[PDB]
RNA sequence: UCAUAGGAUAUGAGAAGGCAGACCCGGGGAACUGAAACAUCUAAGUACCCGGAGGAAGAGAAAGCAAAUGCGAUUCCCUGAGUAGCGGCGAGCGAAACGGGAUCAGCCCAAACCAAGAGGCUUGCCUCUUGGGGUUGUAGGACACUCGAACGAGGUAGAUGAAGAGGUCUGGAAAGGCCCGCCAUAGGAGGUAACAGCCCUGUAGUCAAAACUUCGUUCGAGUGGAUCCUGAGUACGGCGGAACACGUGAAAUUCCGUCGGAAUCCGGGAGGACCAUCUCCCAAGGCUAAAUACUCCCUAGUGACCGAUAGUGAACCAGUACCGUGAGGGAAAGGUGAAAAGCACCCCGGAAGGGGAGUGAAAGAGAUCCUGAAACCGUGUGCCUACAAGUAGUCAGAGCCCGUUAACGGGUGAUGGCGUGCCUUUUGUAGAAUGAACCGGCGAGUUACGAUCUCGUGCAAGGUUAAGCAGAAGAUGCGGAGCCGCAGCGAAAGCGAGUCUGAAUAGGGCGCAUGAGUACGUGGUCGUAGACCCGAAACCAGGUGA
RNA sequence: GUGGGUAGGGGUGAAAUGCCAAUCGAACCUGGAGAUAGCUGGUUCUCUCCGAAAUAGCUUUAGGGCUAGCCUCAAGGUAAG
RNA sequence: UAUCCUUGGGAGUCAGACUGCGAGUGAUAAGAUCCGUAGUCGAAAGGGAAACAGCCCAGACCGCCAGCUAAGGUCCCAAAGU
RNA sequence: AACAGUGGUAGGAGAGCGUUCUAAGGGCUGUGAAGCCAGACCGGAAGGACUGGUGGAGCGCUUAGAAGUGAGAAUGCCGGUAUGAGUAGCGAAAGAGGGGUGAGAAUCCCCUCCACCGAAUGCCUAAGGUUUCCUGAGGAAGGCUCGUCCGCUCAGGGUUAGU
RNA sequence: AGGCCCAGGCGACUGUUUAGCAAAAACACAGGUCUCUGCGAAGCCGUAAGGCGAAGUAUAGGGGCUGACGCCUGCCCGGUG
RNA sequence: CCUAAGGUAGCGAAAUUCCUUGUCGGGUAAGUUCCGACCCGCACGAAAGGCGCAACGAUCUGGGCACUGUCUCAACGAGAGACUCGGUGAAAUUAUAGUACCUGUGAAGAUGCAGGUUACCCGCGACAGGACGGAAAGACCCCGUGGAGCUUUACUGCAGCCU
RNA sequence: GGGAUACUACCCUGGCUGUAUUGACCUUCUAACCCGCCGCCCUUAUCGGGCGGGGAGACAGUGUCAGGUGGGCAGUUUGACUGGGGCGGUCGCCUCCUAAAAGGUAACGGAGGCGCCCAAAGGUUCCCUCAGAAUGGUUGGAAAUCAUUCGCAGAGUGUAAAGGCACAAGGGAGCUUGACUGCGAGACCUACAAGUCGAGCAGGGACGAAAGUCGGGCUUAGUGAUCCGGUGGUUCCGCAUGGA
């Protein structure tokens, strides 16, 4: 509330939509990959453990 | 009773990195013939909320 | 006076009415309040009224969830998530599936056709009762081929149950102090003239039932697919409403009232308007326990719960006295002593009440009777006071009196200086502004769930469990579903230490590059809850009164 | 006089807002209900460090409220003042 | 001389008054109202102006039967110069 | 050691004091705890000791924990007691006297006059009251005084219907 | 167990009302007027069954207004109904 | 010029008249009242009825006779309170009080402040000038983004009725 | 005369008859529905209900929907400032003074204006110069239109005041649409919301030979949030998939 002066949020406009479809991918950088040994196979199931 | 997010604000704001909130500009809905092109171009861009208003609405956007 | 209401008789552990101020279904259904007004909305399908059973009820075996080398009845707990959404796009409201748990039961019909008996005949079109006939979606079935005892455990009454009047001291009284013993599957609890494992009742273990009463053991198929069936005034639509988190909106889905109104497996319904392909499924018929909710009750127990202005209104003859016509409102009041041993007897007195005597550890303990504060009321007294006006004190101070937690002491103070109480609210109060008659008790910023920040911890590019299952209502173990970070930008597709804008390899915005967060605890503050405590006039629902 | 009827988004009224159990411009009792109160009052132990404002803007706003100014505590820039 | 700025946690304040000085309104009236500027009070006791918040001097951490002063004052009340 | 500072409302920050219970360690207590009462003691404060009297069974200290944790005001609630104050009031009214009883008599009983009502202050009887009616005892409370008295207390007794 | 007389407003009169400030010029009144209603009248209570109206029938009922009696009650239908 | 029509009869400083105690006459020594009359009716008027009206009125207004303590202007007397004694015995209020008068100051009106002036201690009977006396959190006024009742061509709805 | 349409079978240049369907006026009845009409029975019953008769009658009543009317009834609103309220006046923006030689600074203080206008009154290149006065000149004067002289600004600048403008920002002509798109280093102003200026870069232009100017008026007013909805473009999403 702002004492009847209309609050900032209501003064400001609305922005765009959001949708159900959305592929958020678990990010992993190369710096993390160094922790594995030489010559290994790295796959998501292994990354989980 | 866990806190309720203020949906009327959540539909307007967005929390950028470093914890600041991004906003659009007002006065951009339905009068444009009474505004020179310069300010129209300027208001087209997005801005960020002020320090005092940020301090005031800290609570209302607790859960992003 | 065909025949029906109607009437008469008999037979029915048949209904009613109550209840636990709880829980579950429904039918009906507010305003206060929030929105800082107010009508959509909220409060809230809450309060309240009504009907209905249960010990639990509702729900239920897919016309489902979901889009994958798929799951397989419902119910409830964490999580999803304050997300997707809804909303005078305000105030606010607000899910579900996937995932992890407790629990685990699937079944029975109508229809087809067979059999009969069921008569009306207009020879099966309908009977009605059985059975075969059957309960099904990458369909199934008709139809032809295929086989009311004795026993264990409790519950209600109970039984048995170890070890010291140990000595000594004080004391009215040992359970207490000192010095010594013993039992302990028992050191639970209470009482015992003070604080007891060994004094008593009992406690740990071990037993017990004539009679009722609650729990566990005996007394069908597969192959074929001509024909037939697979829930009609039903689904669904228009109109107007309601529930779905969803306010008519893109408005799917469910139900209600009016009207209209399908198809039958080459068939139908759903996958959030709607169409097509695909995927899943078979409504318009029923039953179904456990997980779950709640205590008027009973049994055994627990409390960093109260201790007589508390704690139930009610420790005590309390929903009583009392008030009200009535609905209804609604108090106060615990404590002699260990044992009454509760005061023989005498004196004043009419008694009451006293003084003695006696009991007892205490009579100052005597019927509010353990302790007995203050206000208040009195009696003696050391100092002062009748020529002085005083927020009454303080600082000086003679005189008089007393002699201490011994110290540059105590009481009183003739006389001088200074000086308008406390609290709130105010620019401002001695204020002729407000509140207190005085004393005592009671009497106001907490708790839960989230958020954020500081501080402290264990780990750290990782941190961390929730529900739940074991576990003395505990810790601890398991439980990786889930949540926050390590990457950001954009509305989004999407790209990525870059990304957005833009024709731009230009400029500019955003964290770059200048790497700690997480779990928990205290503390500050915030948000939802009555939220810091007292106070409205008034509104709405149900009743009581002429 | 006795026995009865009319019950509160009502009843009665030769009409005053009269009466309806000493209450009536809408009776009484319980519940929603600890209604709400931007209003009035009050809010309890002590010492120490620092220590304001009564202003601007906007407000169905004027004795209220939000932001800014002014206060305080902590971590930093450090020498800007 | 050492107070300044950034971030973060927690506030109260939105009724101000008077006295100089420069103005408005008022009748250059008001202990009037509204501004700017400085001070005190607000939130500040002490000494002075008899008594007094805002006028003057001047800031209380406590004790002392010490001294020097500021405004004001020295005939008595009443300290100090008839 | 030096130097500087130490008025303060709304406010912010830090230090503490006390209270009730809970754990661990210690021990105080009928050779008298708690509580209360009185002292001329100690600390910067909230406060804490010590010595007596009362009282007659429980209770401090130490470290930490959790709070129904601290009252002087709310025309606060409850209980008790003041003030006004020995003041107002003692509720329309004719009694007077002699005996009686009695601890006590204006007030109770008896007697003699006097006085008041008399379409009532008389005589019956409703609603209603529910033992208050009668006899014998008592006088703490009720009785606006007293009271030997009664519509009060105690023990008994009392209401007879075919009309 | 009457004071009386003269005049004047208001109200014809008897009556009724603000229990508990106001008893009046306010209310009522008989009278007058307008209008509704053909009887399962209209109007009214109730949702509806049921009623009152009324075991009544436009010389009767409901509603509005004015208020004995005497003389009278003029103009405007533009507006609202 | 305008209206749809422009107030006729009756009455008129009236329950209606601010100017206003209208102007004139009566009544009285004197009349803002009263009665009668005039009309310049701010702002009478015909069913919100107009104008009179015998009778009536705890109605309102003016005048007159009788009457008197209403008065000049008070006096006395009777009874109940008050007053003294005896018995019994409250209440509103109350920050503590050893509670003077002037002038002045002050939140502008002092008992408590300043400077003076007066005042031995304590009671009994009366007065109400003050203690802005007590009773009542002002019924007046103002403000709550308070409440309630009522009204309408305020808004939005609803019952009823009509189609 | 244009195709004079003379032996498919034209649509009717739009006409009607005989045939199944729809609305109103008509009258009927069984036949619904109604009957606070009558006779009998249930039945010692003025309730209702069975029959019969009679009257009405597809109307009415009732159910759903729709429109009108509707203070009879219900929930609400009816602003603030204010030298107390009410009434009066005002409410946003722009210019000046009050304003105390930076900025800022109130009053129901003192004076005015705005809710537009301009396809040229913009941009650019190029060229000048005013108002008033005196004197001659007719229709024609006090001023029409001419010629000389004087003339620092008195005149103009779209409009209201101030600032500033004759090296034009005033006046005239030609061309033109920068009255552009993407932006924007910095800075002013600021509680927030917003408001203002801005060099410089890229793409394309306009003007001019070039330099170089142009991102609207000579500077300051001429204008409003969000929500919702309408319209155009979309290399965005669009609930199993493709579309919507």
TrEMBL record, chain A:
Outline what the protein does.
Answer: Binds to the 23S rRNA.
Q: How does it assemble?
A: Part of the 50S ribosomal subunit.
Instruction: Say which family it is in.
Output: Belongs to the universal ribosomal protein uL15 family.
User: What name does this protein carry?
Assistant: Large ribosomal subunit protein uL15
Designated gene of the protein: rplO
The shown residues of the full protein are 50 to 98 of 146
From TrEMBL, chain B:
Residue ranges, annotated region (Disordered): 1-47
Which family is this protein grouped under? Belongs to the bacterial ribosomal protein bL35 family.
According to its UniProt entry, one GO biological process term is: translation
Q: Which GO terms describe its cellular component?
A: cytosolic large ribosomal subunit
Name its species.
Answer: Bacillus subtilis
Which GO molecular function annotations are given, in alphabetical order?
structural constituent of ribosome
Please give the NCBIfam families that the UniProt record associates with this protein. rpmI_bact
Q: Tell me the superkingdom of the source.
A: Bacteria
Pfam (any one)? Ribosomal_L35p
Tell me the organism's taxonomic lineage.
Answer: Bacteria, Bacillati, Bacillota, Bacilli, Bacillales
PANTHER family with a match to the protein in the record: 54S RIBOSOMAL PROTEIN BL35M, LARGE RIBOSOMAL SUBUNIT PROTEIN BL35M
Give start-end positions of Basic residues composition bias. 1-25
Q: Does the keyword Ribonucleoprotein apply?
A: yes
Q: Does the keyword tRNA processing apply?
A: no
Q: What is this protein called?
A: Large ribosomal subunit protein bL35
Q: Which PROSITE patterns match?
A: RIBOSOMAL_L35
Q: Which UniProt keywords apply?
A: Ribonucleoprotein, Ribosomal protein
């Amino acid at each position: 509330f702002e004492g009847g002066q209309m609050p900032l949020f209501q003064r400001l406009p609305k922005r765009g939509f959001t949708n159900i479809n959305r592929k958020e991918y678990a990010v992993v950088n190369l710096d993390k990959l160094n922790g594995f040994a030489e010559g290994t196979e790295v796959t998501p199931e292994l990354l989980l453990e | 009773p866990k806190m309720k997010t203020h949906r009327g604000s959540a539909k307007r704001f967005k929390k950028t990195g470093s914890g600041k909130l991004k906003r659009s500009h007002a006065y951009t809905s339905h009068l444009f013939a009474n505004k020179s092109q310069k300010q129209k171009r300027k208001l087209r861009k997005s801005s960020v909320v002020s320090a005092g208003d940020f301090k005031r609405i800290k609570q209302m956007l607790a859960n992003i």
